[PDB]
Design a protein around this ligand. Structure first.
Ligand SMILES: [Mn+2]
Ligand SMILES: [Mn+2]
Ligand SMILES: [Mn+2]
Ligand SMILES: [Mn+2]
Lengths: 209, 211, 209, 210
């Protein structure tokens, strides 16, 4: 089954002033679309290989699949993780706030740690807040590229893209300012919904019921 | 604030010599007691550093500690899946039925085509790593990929349902450099019942986490 | 003796000297922000090693060496990158001399070389570099990619011509279109510099190993 | 267009059993005859694909083939340095003199401090890789780093003069999981004469190179 580019949940200019329209348009129509196409291209090669029509370098094509699939799913989460300022921004409540209190000692400490993780990604990558199916707790990590340092199990519920293309046109080299500004468009309702699903569904995938 | 729940080393589902002749007792023992244990400890040690940082007790390099967490957590979960993915010959080995066989037929064109591809993926991991059969929550289909170390090339979303460890420590004492022979022999201990149960859970649970 | 500090080199030309192919704002940010950050990071890693050697602190050796690796590599790669370019006239065109001779022998001529090098640069996954290197084991040219600054690079190979395809190298001008950037970059290649490096490599490299 | 010069497997500088009791004969045989040979073949195979691409016979994935070249070339050169970096106990082992000892004193505050740092670097490689002592052409000083696989974390410029292989295949048959004991014992076969000769060449050639 082939991957498809999802529409954004909002207008290309909907995250302004925090992320400009030009970035949103390039990011979605070029970058994300390229990962969708790359993932499908890798699958097509695997198909031709399985049908015996070609012989592929299995390692190489799977590396291509890994990178592009990861790019696709990460951007798929990234867009609805944001919302126009109002619906987006502010401080979380509910289950997310509760786990943030338990795991990190409150929102301010969480924000400082998450921001540090995002700002200090070496090269391009992501800051990731994930739900751990083994402990049913939150974990923060970095991902390099789309597919380096990511682990099995951990379910991303909030991600920030710190690839240079995510901010350079507006913030230039100042990734720090981008990260600080990104908090203003975080869709906590989306994160809350993701956590609800993870609490219900994640653990049984690994520790059988 | 509540102190993190510690990771723990699970027992094996069988004795150390239970996978003979395909994987020797000495490997199973070292693999479990030394290697898997080390990843459990490493994951806990990283979380302890994060805890002390959050309590204002120490300085940490956030990137470094998270790299440590990534590698060791990944090692832990991958081995946690690896052990029950195998079973003593008899319960282990053979060819799958059920939903696993159905998806293998529809996607890979049958078990032999799947086996050849999975074996090639495992054999050709560059350096140490894993061959992985995963459930894709976006398409509700199977995908095969490689993972290097424990935490390189792995992606979000994909749920491993069957993994083969091709780190050198998984085979060297018995098979020496001949990883190919190890991979071929490993099929004789695959626990298809476990794989089927994992797929069942994924079919029921995975997609809603993301969409 | 305290380690010798790395230093930011001046550019061989003004910030606007590579126009219209690479705009002034890019050259300024690239040199003053990005390259300077790698210099500072390389020095910072060695300061940590020094405090460890003085017995004052205990460090995570793996972590600090990863920092050294990335930042040292960033520093050296950019150090080669700047003089690898020159204002159009001195920069651009088709090489002669020893480099042209090896290009004929290894790659079957300049057009074939250019196509291969361009493909290598364009298809770097994530951020990184296209690299033309001298192989001390064979005394021949080899092309490879480097991801980040310090992934896929090998011992031995001496880079003689590099192109930076990190997003910051082109995004402000070329946006997502790395391909057009790579095509344009040829017009500022300083072939006299590449020639000097190859000659040094032919005379110096093999004995090291 | 002339066909590429092939990489070749260098012979060992000593018998397969010459590093005993510190590294057993079986490891040396497998390591040289199976593993190193595989990297030589892999590097050549990648270049063959590049050749066929340039001659218009095939259309390659340039990234994929260059990744193959990178890993295998790196494997080849790292092992090529690794073997003569060791010597039978007597010629091998002990502590360095000459220029190596001089820079070690200046950079690291002496041999025991250097040894502690290099040992820690080797023991703490995550996954498989190498501990590396390198000469920096930019500063004409020694640097220690790790390399993962053969071709991850390695940088341009730095010239390895002493390397230790900590891939599992380098020790597992003898030391099992105990990489630490392997690293501790490897010091007893280090060929300081070889390292000294490499440093001499680096001091003479590396900076003028860059
Ligand atoms: Mn992006
Ligand atoms: Mn293992
Ligand atoms: Mn750059
Ligand atoms: Mn080796």
């Amino acid at each position: 089954k082939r991957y498809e580019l999802p529409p954004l949940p909002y207008n290309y200019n909907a995250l302004e002033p925090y992320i400009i329209e030009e970035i949103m348009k390039l990011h979605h129509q070029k970058h994300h679309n390229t990962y969708v196409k790359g993932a499908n291209a890798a699958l097509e090669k695997i198909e031709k290989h399985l049908k015996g029509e070609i012989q592929i370098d299995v390692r190489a094509v799977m590396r291509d699949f890994s990178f592009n699939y990861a790019g696709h799913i990460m951007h798929t989460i990234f867009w609805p993780n944001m919302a126009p300022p109002g619906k987006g921004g502010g401080t979380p409540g509910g289950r997310v706030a509760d786990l943030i209190e338990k795991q990190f000692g409150g929102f301010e400490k969480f924000k400082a740690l998450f921001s540090a993780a995002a700002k200090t990604v070496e090269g391009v990558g992501w800051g990731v807040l994930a739900f751990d199916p083994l402990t049913e707790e939150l974990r923060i990590l970095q991902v390099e590229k789309h597919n380096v340092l990511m682990t099995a199990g951990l379910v991303p519920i909030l991600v920030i893209d710190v690839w240079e293309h995510a901010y350079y046109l507006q913030y230039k080299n100042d990734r720090g300012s981008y990260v600080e500004n990104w908090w203003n468009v975080v869709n906590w309702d989306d994160v809350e919904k993701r956590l609800e699903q993870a609490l219900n569904n994640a653990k049984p995938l690994y520790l059988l019921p």
